[PDB]
C-alpha cells in the first residue's frame, strides 16, 4: 500500500500518480533520525515561577539583571527603549506559553522529540570558550534580542518568496521557535548560562547549521520506511488489543469485536 | 529533388573525450557521420548548413555506462527521388540488358523493356550504344528519364527509369 510514496523536491509527499498525501513530510519536514526528546521550558510551572525566570525589569533595581554578571550594569537602569525591547520579548514569551498550553499540548506534557539538541550546544559552547569564572559578560541586551529574533527567521524548511510559501514556512517551525525562545531568553543567557559574545554567535551559527542538516532529503522513500517501522513492532507483540485489533483497524472492519464509547460528562 | 529539412541526431561520447574541445569534436563527428550518408527514409544528405555553429545542448550521462548522450539538431540539404518524376541524367554504362545513368549520387538502371523499340542496342558501335535513326544514346550522353520505381536498401537507394514516353530519351 505504501511503497510508491516519496518526498519530492518541493517538500510535498506524493504517490506515483502525483496526488498529494502530505503538504510537508511529518508536518515539519524533518528526518526521523535527527530528532531528540527535549523539554519546552515555557509550558510547565506556575505563573510566578515563569515570571521570575523570564521577566527582566530595568526600573526596579532588585528585579533587574545582577550587576556582577554584566560589565555595563551602570548605564542600564532607567533606559526606556531597552525596556521596550525587553517587554516585547516577554510578550512574545507569554504568547508562546498561551499557544502551547491552550492549543497544542492541553495536558501539559512538555517532553517532545524536536530537532537540534539545545542543551548539548550550550554546554559545548561553555566548554569551548571557558565560560566559567565570575567574569562579567560583554554581551549587550539588544544583541541578544536581535540575534535570537533574526535566528528565528533563518530556519528554512521551504525556499521562496511566495506569500503562501512564507506562511507554510512560519507554520512548520512554530514548536521549534518556541523551544529556541524558551532556552535563549535574555535572563537565562546572561545569568544561567553566562555566555559572552563569541559564544553567542557560535551558538546561533551552530543552531542554524544543525537545523539545516536535520531536514529530510528529497528522494526519501518514506512510505516503505513507514510501513517497515509500523510492521516491525507487530512481529514482537475488556477491549481487543494486539494483532487482532490491528487487523481490525487495517481492514476497516464494519463490526469490530468490542464496540465502545467514551462519554464525558459536564463539569458539575 | 533537393529539399531543406530539420533533422536530429543522437550522439554518444566516450568519457575519454570529456575535455574543453568537446563541442568542436562533436561537431566534426556529426559532419563525418552525416555528410554523404544515404537513408532510405530521407534519401541522401549532401551538406549540413551552418556546420560550425550547431547547437548541441547538454549531454545526459547514461546510467551504468558513463558515456554521455547528446541530442544534436541541424538543418541539412537532402535529395530524394520520387515515383513518377522526370529528371535529367548522364549515361554511365551501356549494356545489352539496358543502360545505367547517374542522377547526382543516385545510379539509375533502365531496362530494355522500358526503352523505345527504335533505339536498338548497337554493340558494334564505338562505344556501344542504344541508337535509332535520329537518336544515339551512349556513355556520357545527356538523357531525360522518368523515375518509375525506387528500391530501398540498408544504406542505398536503387531507382528504375524509363524513356518510353514523350519528351524523354536523348536530350
Amino acid at each position: 500500500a505504501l511503497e510508491d510514496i516519496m518526498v519530492h523536491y518541493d517538500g510535498t509527499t506524493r504517490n506515483s500518480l502525483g496526488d498529494i498525501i502530505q503538504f510537508l513530510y511529518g508536518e515539519d519536514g524533518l528526518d526521523g533520525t535527527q530528532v531528540e526528546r527535549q523539554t519546552i521550558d515555557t509550558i510547565p510551572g506556575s505563573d510566578k515561577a515563569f515570571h521570575k525566570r523570564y521577566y527582566v525589569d530595568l526600573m526596579d533595581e532588585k528585579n533587574s539583571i545582577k550587576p556582577d554578571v554584566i560589565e555595563y550594569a551602570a548605564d542600564i537602569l532607567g533606559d526606556v527603549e531597552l525596556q521596550k525591547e525587553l517587554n516585547s520579548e516577554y510578550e512574545q514569551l507569554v504568547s508562546d506559553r498561551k499557544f502551547l498550553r491552550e492549543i497544542v499540548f492541553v495536558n501539559g506534557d512538555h517532553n517532545w522529540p524536536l530537532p537540534v539538541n539545545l542543551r548539548r550546544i550550550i554546554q559545548n559552547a561553555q566548554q569551548i570558550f571557558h565560560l566559567d569564572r565570575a567574569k562579567a559578560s560583554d554581551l549587550t541586551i539588544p544583541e541578544i534580542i536581535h540575534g535570537v529574533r533574526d535566528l528565528c527567521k533563518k530556519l528554512f524548511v521551504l525556499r521562496g518568496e511566495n506569500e503562501l510559501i512564507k506562511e507554510a514556512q512560519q507554520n512548520a517551525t512554530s514548536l521549534f521557535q518556541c523551544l529556541v525562545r524558551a532556552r535563549l531568553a535574555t535572563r537565562r543567557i546572561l545569568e544561567e548560562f553566562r555566555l559572552n559574545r563569541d559564544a553567542f554567535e557560535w551558538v546561533l551559527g551552530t543552531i542554524e547549521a544543525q537545523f539545516q542538516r536535520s531536514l529530510v532529503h528529497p528522494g526519501e522513500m518514506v512510505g516503505v520506511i513507514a510501513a517497515q517501522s509500523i510492521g516491525e513492532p507487530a512481529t514482537q507483540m475488556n477491549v481487543t488489543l494486539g494483532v487482532p485489533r490491528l487487523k481490525e483497524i487495517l481492514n476497516v472492519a464494519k463490526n469490530i469485536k468490542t464496540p465502545a464509547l467514551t462519554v464525558y460528562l459536564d463539569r458539575e | 529533388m533537393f529539399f531543406l529539412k530539420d533533422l536530429s541526431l543522437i550522439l554518444t561520447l566516450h568519457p575519454s573525450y570529456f575535455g574543453p574541445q568537446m563541442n568542436q569534436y562533436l561537431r566534426e563527428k556529426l559532419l563525418t557521420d552525416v555528410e554523404g550518408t544515404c537513408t532510405g527514409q530521407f534519401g541522401y544528405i549532401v551538406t549540413v548548413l551552418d556546420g560550425m555553429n550547431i547547437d548541441v545542448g547538454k549531454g545526459r550521462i547514461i546510467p551504468g555506462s558513463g558515456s554521455a548522450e547528446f541530442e544534436v539538431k541541424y538543418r541539412a540539404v537532402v535529395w530524394k527521388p520520387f515515383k513518377g518524376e522526370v529528371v535529367d541524367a548522364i549515361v554511365s554504362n551501356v549494356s545489352p540488358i539496358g543502360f545505367f545513368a547517374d542522377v547526382g549520387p543516385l545510379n539509375v538502371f533502365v531496362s530494355t523493356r522500358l526503352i523505345p523499340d527504335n533505339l536498338v542496342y548497337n554493340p558494334s558501335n564505338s562505344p556501344p550504344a542504344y541508337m535509332s535513326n535520329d537518336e544515339l544514346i551512349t556513355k556520357g550522353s545527356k538523357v531525360r528519364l522518368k523515375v518509375v520505381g525506387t528500391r530501398t536498401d540498408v544504406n542505398e537507394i536503387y531507382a528504375i527509369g524509363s524513356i518510353k514516353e514523350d519528351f524523354l530519351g536523348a536530350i
Binding site: 526521523g32 530528532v35 517497515q228 516491525e232 | -
Partner: protein, 549 residues
Amino acid sequence: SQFPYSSAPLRSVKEVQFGLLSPEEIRAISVVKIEYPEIMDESRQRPREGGLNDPKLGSIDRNFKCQTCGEGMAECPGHFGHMELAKPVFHIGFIPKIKKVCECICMNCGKLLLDETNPTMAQAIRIRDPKKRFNAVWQLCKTKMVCEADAPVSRGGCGNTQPVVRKDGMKLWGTWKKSRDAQPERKLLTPGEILNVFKHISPEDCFRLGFNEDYARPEWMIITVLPVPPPQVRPSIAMDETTQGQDDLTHKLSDILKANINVQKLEMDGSPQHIINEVEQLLQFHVATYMDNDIAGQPQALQKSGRPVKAIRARLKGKEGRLRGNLMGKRVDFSARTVISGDPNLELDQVGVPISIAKTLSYPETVTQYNIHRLTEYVRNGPNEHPGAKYVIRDNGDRIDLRYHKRAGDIVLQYGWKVERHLMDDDPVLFNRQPSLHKMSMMAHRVKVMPYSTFRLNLSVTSPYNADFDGDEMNLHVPQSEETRAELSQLCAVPLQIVSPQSNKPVMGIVQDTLCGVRKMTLRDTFIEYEQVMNMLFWVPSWDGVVPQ
C-alpha cells in the same frame, strides 16, 4: 556490452499500452500457420513444417539456428504462429463482460438502449474513466428491457424486445418474452451471433461503453484466430537420456488443433446438429481450459497422469507465479551463504569472509594506468592463488578463462579491459539475513579475508540482524560496478545505520559479556595495576600514547 552489436538505438520503456489483439494483427505478426496436429514429421528429426514445432517459430537447440531471424538460441526471442478456428469461441476471461455488453445494447440493431436525451445518461457519459463510465451506463441501460424503434422521431432502434441473458458455464442463454402471460423462448447465444452483432456497433457507442476504438474493440473478446506461442514459452524437457517430454501447453495446443480439424471435417461431410453441438462444445472447452483451468462449476482438464493441466493463468498467479516468483524477486548471481560466527576482534563495519568464498566470487576491475601493474600481478597469480583473478574480459566482450589458458604469462593487459579479480580486503559487500523485517537487515560491510568456513561479525551488529551464532546463516551479495560500489559505501554502510528512523534511537549497543564486563569494570572498587594498565592502553586503537595519571 554482453550483447552483440545492433545498430538500432537503445531506449527505455516510458509507457505500457494495454489492449486486445485484433485477428488482423494476429495474422499480421504471425510467421507460419499451424494446422497439422502431429508434433514430429516421421520421428526422424526435422519436426514437421506447419506443425506445433515448426522451425520458423524459433530455435531451442544449440546447433540449430532460427529459420526466421537466423540468430542463435541465446538471441532468438521466439516468433508467433497463428491457428485459424473453424468456429468462433468465447474468451474465458471476458464472458461476464460479454454478458454485460449484451445487456447494454440491442441484439438486432446493435445500438445502445438509452440516449443522451435522458439527463442521467448524459451525466453518466460525462464521466472520464472508462470502467466507471461502463458501470454507470450498464446500471442505467440494464433496466431498459425493450429496444425502441421510435424516440422515447426514430432513434435508430428496431423496436424488438431485449432478451434476458443468463450465464451457464461457457454458454449464455437469452430469453425472449415473445408475444397476459405467453410462451417465452430461451435460445442459445452462439459466439458467432454475438460476434456479428458486435461488429455492427458504432464507434461512438463503443466509446460510450468504455471500450477503445483503436485498442480494445468489443468484438475482439471472441476468439476467431488463436496465436500459437513459440517453443521458448513451452520448452520441452528430457525426462531421461532417450525420451523427452512435451510441455503441457504443447499437449493442450495439440488437443485444440485436433478439435479444430474434427470440426472442419464434420462440417463439410454431414451435419447432424447434435454432433455439431457436441464437437463445437468440446472445442470451446479445450480453448477455455488452455488459458484457465480453474473455472468454478465444471471439472478440470486432466493429464494422462491424473494431474490437472497447468493452464497459462496458473503460470502467473501465486508465490511461485511469474510476477511474484520471477519478476518481483528472482535468484541472482554473485552471492554466497554460510553459517555466521562472532569475532570480538573485528571493527563494527567489517565481515570475515572465508578464503574459498573470496576465490569463488569476483569483481570486474577496469584496467587503467593506476592499477595495470597490480592487475598484471593478479593475472599471473592465476585463479588458485590469492590474490588472483578468474577472467580477463576484452573490450569487444570476449572472456578469457584463466583456468584453461596455457599462456597466462603471455597476456598483456590493455587499458579499458576488465579483470575479474578475486574478492579482496575492504571491498564493500551487501550483507543480509532473512526475514528482512526492516532496512537495517541489509547493511554493507567491508571484506576481510579469513581462514575457516564461517562469516564473522562484530557482536554489536547482531541486534539489527536479529542474529545469534547457534546455527544462523546470512547472505552476502557482491556489487559488480563502480556506481554500485559507491552506492553501497555511501548509503547502506553500517556506521550510517546506527540510529534508526523508527524510534530515533540507536539500534546497536554494547551487548552480552561486554556489557557485563563494563558494569563490573566500572564499579567503584575496581583498581588496576600499572602493568595491566599498560596492556589495556595499548589495546585501544585510538589511544594517543599518553598514559593518564
